[PDB]
Symmetry: C2
């Protein structure tokens, strides 16, 4: 008999914890649905912030916080703490309960070292437990300010939208930090409205990376992109045929591959591990590669083409090279790399994005420059082609930020100028 007690005896809470695992609801805790039919680009609603935490909101407290930070660095930068404290002191009791009951990864978290130190050093009256609660509500529910670099903004209804790597809704800031929410796609009444918790600088990357970016909200993303059978953002050059793409995919810590697009062969697990090592090596190299040294980026790109076929690392190298060539006035190769960028993004992330729209616009710029090196009279055909790209940019920006937005009117301006120069 190896029983230490009767197995039917009631457990203690620690003993229960040994057997089972509670999972708290994925951030940000709620789903939001449209009540009506929406056409692409139409406004769903516009929301004013609960609070805009700016140094300008309380610079007394700001100087104090920055000086506390300079003496002993604090885990979250000062802005998060100005936001939290001003959320506990500046709003009404109701506004307060609106932010305290938003989603948080650790509801019962004890006050951190940082929190108690701020309370004692700045001598404030707010409860440490609520101070902690609020620092995480803004860590996991706010948006970065549009212009001011140490600024953040919280909204109430916006936090109700679940995450998706292929979001149904897009957004942009209005004039007084208004949050303008638009339909990114055609929607029917009752459809879910989702936004990307992850920035556009990572949305074009592969499933493993995006999942790493949203793990903080304590879920493994299973959105339509993230759960797709083929991760077409993670393609390696097949070593058998030398030209097709094999797309890798990681689930439960194990990586598998699609069959090569051309020769239909599957790589062995040993080849998969080999190319995962290559992948990590080039991810590391990307941090040392940039547009101020184009020869170096050319070296890295040449080496990377042997490893990658339609991969976000290769897209990043195309980006570096395009910006380097564009800055140097070399429209010829900038053109090639920009066309590869358009190919990649339209395969991997086809819905309207600022990245794609400005890919089309900047392709228009590059083509127009290259053409104008032959003289101002650019032939009709070329003009039309250039115009098409500008138009595409317009068409996407129209959906993302509206007819009269500065981006949209810029793209449309270039388009109509192109038409103006037509015979």
């Amino acid at each position: 008999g190896s029983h230490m007690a009767n197995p039917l005896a009631p457990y203690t809470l620690p003993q229960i914890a040994t057997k089972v695992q509670v999972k708290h609801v994925p951030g940000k805790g709620r789903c939001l649905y449209t009540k009506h039919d929406l056409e692409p680009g139409s406004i769903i609603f516009v929301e004013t912030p609960v609070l805009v935490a700016i140094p300008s909101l309380d610079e007394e407290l700001w100087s104090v916080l920055t000086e506390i930070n300079d003496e002993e660095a604090l885990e979250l930068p000062p802005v998060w703490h100005l936001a939290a404290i001003c959320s506990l002191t500046m709003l009404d009791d109701e506004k307060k309960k609106i932010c305290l009951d938003k989603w948080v990864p650790d509801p019962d978290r004890a006050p951190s070292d940082d929190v108690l130190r701020v309370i004692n050093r700045a001598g404030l009256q707010v409860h440490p437990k609520l101070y902690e609660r609020m620092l995480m509500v803004w860590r996991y529910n706010s948006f970065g300010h549009h212009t001011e670099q140490h600024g953040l903004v919280l909204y109430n209804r916006i936090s109700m939208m679940a995450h998706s790597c292929r979001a149904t809704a897009c957004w942009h800031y209005g004039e007084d930090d208004a949050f303008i929410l638009r339909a990114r796609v055609k929607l029917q009444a009752g459809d879910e409205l989702t936004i990307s918790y992850i920035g556009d600088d990572d949305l074009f990357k592969s499933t493993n990376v995006r999942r790493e970016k949203v793990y903080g909200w304590l879920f493994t993303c299973q959105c339509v992109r993230c759960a797709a059978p083929v991760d077409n953002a993670r393609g390696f050059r097949c070593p058998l045929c030398g030209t097709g793409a094999m797309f890798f995919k990681t689930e439960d810590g194990e990586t598998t591959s699609s069959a090569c697009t051309i020769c239909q062969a599957f790589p062995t697990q040993e080849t998969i591990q080999e190319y995962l090592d290559f992948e990590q090596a080039y991810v590391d190299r990307l941090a040392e590669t940039d547009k101020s040294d184009v020869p170096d980026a050319e070296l890295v790109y040449n080496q990377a083409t042997r490893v990658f076929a339609q991969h976000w690392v290769l897209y990043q190298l195309h980006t570096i090279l395009f910006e380097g060539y564009r800055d140097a006035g070399n429209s010829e190769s900038a053109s090639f790399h920009q066309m590869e960028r358009i190919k990649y993004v339209s395969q991997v992330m086809p819905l309207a994005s600022y990245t794609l729209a400005w890919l089309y616009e900047e392709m228009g710029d590059t083509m127009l420059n290259k053409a104008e090196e032959s003289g101002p009279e650019v032939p009709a055909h070329k003009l039309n082609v250039i115009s098409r790209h500008f138009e595409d940019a317009y068409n996407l920006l129209y959906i993302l930020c509206g007819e009269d937005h500065d981006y949209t009117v810029a793209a449309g301006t270039k388009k109509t100028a192109c038409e103006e120069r037509l015979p």
Copy 2:
């Protein structure tokens, strides 16, 4: 309950013929891409030099009264009944035909009477069908056909697992186009490469003669990504049309995910037919006209074989005129299209990569013979891709493969020391 007559039965049910060419073929071994599966000699090579007297006769009866099938088919059929031993004459007569019971055509009885041959009409007729539905065009000779025994046992696929090319003495060299395991089916395209990159409706039209509606992996795919129109709502995404049982539906737009109405679908089908008609009057000898048609076509199409055809016309026109700048753009669009709709190894794709290499090398050389390393490497990549595909299609030592690899190694030789 009284028995039906045969016409009464035919009113109620529809019989499905064994689809041409009647058989399936499977590999007994694992195959690497590009490996030779086997090489087969022809049962017969029908060319004028096979029987010049018969040929001259044939010609003159054709010029008096035109034959429905050109003379070479009759040369093939007759010579199959006259010149082959009994063993091989039976292998030909055993081959798939659409109409086993078909009475002698009037062309057949005429040729029998005016050439004065002793062959049985009904066999003659049947042999015709055999050669029309089982033979290949000769590599060199116009008015030439070739018929093989084992090759005819491969079923058709628009995404074939096997590829082929002619060797010396009209040998049929069959290679694996993809990696295959023992027991996998060997298929070839009954459709020429001039149609393989087109949409499912068109390919099915091209194989209807073998009496089946193609349901290969491409034709049965939920989305026909060779038939993509420009979404009228968003102005930028693609909506892919699909036709089944005479009715056309559309995928949601790739960008705004709206579905077109049946009205919009019919409108864009009318546009599609109009541009298919215009293609017959559009070609590379009038580049301005093709530019007009392309400019109007971009408003209708997003990723469509008609747009690919216009890209092809413009690429060849600009290439012939030495305009590497515009040819570059259109060739890139061609590569995009083909690699999306027809990604497996093909001569079309391989030579798309090779000619992209040519165009970029020309364009670069307009700046001087010393082409920078980067550009060279990119150019080399294209050449290498061409090589890689032709290696699979026709072997390492084939003239095509050697040509692509030659351009590639030349590119590498021009690279600076550092």
